[model samples]
Target: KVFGRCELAAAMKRHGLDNYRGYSLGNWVCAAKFESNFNTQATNRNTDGSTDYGILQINSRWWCNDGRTPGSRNLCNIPCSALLSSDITASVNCAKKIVSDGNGMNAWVAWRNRCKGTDVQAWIRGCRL
Candidate 1:
């Protein structure tokens, strides 16, 4: 089955990411929805100054200078949407790294535990990578 914004949101909620519901998830879903309608393989050129690409809006430069290899630099070089198809869990794992500095789900759990009442960015900071 293909994963879309709703499916990804459901997965996030199922994994106890309710805090991300209105903030991060909402924003991500909005962006992903607009970019690819939840298609993880979607790619777009940012009209804004930022250079975001892929399902998670991973910057190409961050992953690879050539934008062709998986796991290039610190970012994965696979197509952004490939994360949804190849390994949703790994996709989330990668997001966790971005949000928590490679701490994995534990960072998410920690965000839930320690940053429940803070602003979205503040809550992210509470996450320990």
Candidate 2:
């Protein structure tokens, strides 16, 4: 996928995520690292049946739709495949909406469990802004 933190940071900034809805660049970067190891193509199926899609592990339960994915609210109105792209545009927009939906980055369990309150500097270390 993207080369590493630099590409991810560039994409996030290009997609209008400089500081983002109040979260730090480090917050988003840290979340992405833990959620999908920074791979846009990443996905995982939960025991609850809803699948997490892309780098943010956005849930099909309320975000992108993959057709066969059950209980997809498709609130982002974007294809899951789009979210899987190295381009972070659609994913960032949807993530902003998700944050505005009331939970902030807390919507991502990976953020809450891994990134929250933890030092996130390493996620953006050596990455040129």
Q: Compute the lDDT of residue 120 as modeled in candidate 2.
A: 80
Which runs in model 1 stand beyond 4 Å of their true positions? 1-5, 20-24, 44-54, 64-72, 75-87, 101-129
Find the candidate with the highest TM-score and give its number: 2
Tens-digit lDDT track for model 2 on 11-89? 7877777777788788888888888888988989888788887888888888888887665689999888888886777
Name the runs in model 2 displaced over 4 angstroms: none
What value does the lDDT take at residue 4 in candidate 1?
Answer: 46
- State which candidate has the highest lDDT: 2
Q: After superposition, how far is residue 39 of candidate 2 from its true place, in Å?
A: 0.7
Single out the weakest 10-residue window by summed lDDT for candidate 2: 1-10
lDDT measured at residue 122 in model 1 versus the true structure, 0 to 100: 30
TM-score for candidate 1, residues paired by index: 0.46
